Design a protein around this ligand. Structure first.
Ligand SMILES: [Zn+2]
Ligand SMILES: [Zn+2]
Length: 79
Protein backbone atom coordinates (compact mmCIF):
# COMPACT_ATOMS: atom_id res chain seq x y z
CA UNK A 1 0.00 0.00 0.00
CA UNK A 2 1.00 3.66 -0.06
CA UNK A 3 2.91 3.85 3.19
CA UNK A 4 3.97 7.42 4.16
CA UNK A 5 6.43 6.34 6.97
CA UNK A 6 9.76 5.13 5.61
CA UNK A 7 11.59 4.78 8.88
CA UNK A 8 14.03 1.97 8.21
CA UNK A 9 14.43 0.93 11.83
CA UNK A 10 17.90 -0.63 11.83
CA UNK A 11 18.87 -3.67 13.88
CA UNK A 12 20.69 -2.88 17.10
CA UNK A 13 23.54 -5.32 17.82
CA UNK A 14 23.36 -4.21 21.44
CA UNK A 15 19.86 -5.74 21.65
CA UNK A 16 19.58 -8.18 18.73
CA UNK A 17 16.34 -6.42 17.91
CA UNK A 18 15.36 -3.08 16.42
CA UNK A 19 12.64 -0.90 17.93
CA UNK A 20 12.30 0.58 21.41
CA UNK A 21 13.50 4.17 21.11
CA UNK A 22 16.06 5.67 18.77
CA UNK A 23 18.68 4.12 16.51
CA UNK A 24 22.16 5.40 15.69
CA UNK A 25 24.39 4.06 12.93
CA UNK A 26 28.14 4.08 13.46
CA UNK A 27 30.46 5.85 11.04
CA UNK A 28 32.54 4.33 8.22
CA UNK A 29 30.39 3.30 5.25
CA UNK A 30 32.14 -0.06 4.96
CA UNK A 31 30.95 -0.80 8.47
CA UNK A 32 27.61 0.88 9.29
CA UNK A 33 27.00 -0.52 12.76
CA UNK A 34 23.50 0.11 14.10
CA UNK A 35 22.58 0.39 17.77
CA UNK A 36 20.53 2.48 20.20
CA UNK A 37 21.33 5.84 21.75
CA UNK A 38 20.73 4.24 25.16
CA UNK A 39 23.25 1.56 24.16
CA UNK A 40 25.82 4.21 23.28
CA UNK A 41 25.44 6.04 26.58
CA UNK A 42 25.47 2.69 28.36
CA UNK A 43 28.72 1.55 26.73
CA UNK A 44 30.31 4.99 26.72
CA UNK A 45 31.71 4.47 23.24
CA UNK A 46 33.45 6.97 20.96
CA UNK A 47 31.27 9.89 19.90
CA UNK A 48 32.68 12.91 18.09
CA UNK A 49 30.36 15.89 18.24
CA UNK A 50 30.54 18.65 15.71
CA UNK A 51 28.18 21.65 15.88
CA UNK A 52 27.38 23.43 12.63
CA UNK A 53 26.06 26.95 12.97
CA UNK A 54 24.41 29.01 10.28
CA UNK A 55 21.88 31.78 9.81
CA UNK A 56 20.02 30.45 6.76
CA UNK A 57 16.69 32.18 6.24
CA UNK A 58 17.68 35.30 8.12
CA UNK A 59 18.00 33.76 11.55
CA UNK A 60 20.00 30.96 13.13
CA UNK A 61 20.27 27.37 12.00
CA UNK A 62 21.85 24.88 14.30
CA UNK A 63 22.60 21.30 13.32
CA UNK A 64 24.63 18.96 15.48
CA UNK A 65 26.41 16.20 13.65
CA UNK A 66 27.69 13.39 15.83
CA UNK A 67 30.31 11.09 14.41
CA UNK A 68 30.04 7.86 16.33
CA UNK A 69 31.80 4.54 16.15
CA UNK A 70 30.43 1.35 17.68
CA UNK A 71 32.13 0.07 20.86
CA UNK A 72 33.91 -2.79 19.08
CA UNK A 73 34.83 -0.34 16.31
CA UNK A 74 37.37 1.54 18.40
CA UNK A 75 40.09 -1.22 18.57
CA UNK A 76 40.09 -1.66 14.70
CA UNK A 77 42.23 1.31 13.82
CA UNK A 78 44.50 1.37 16.85
CA UNK A 79 44.85 5.00 17.89
ZN1 LIG B 1 20.02 -1.61 22.05
ZN1 LIG C 1 30.98 -0.25 13.29
Amino acid sequence: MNIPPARWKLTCYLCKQKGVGASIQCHKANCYTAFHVTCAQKAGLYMKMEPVKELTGGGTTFSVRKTAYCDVHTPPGST
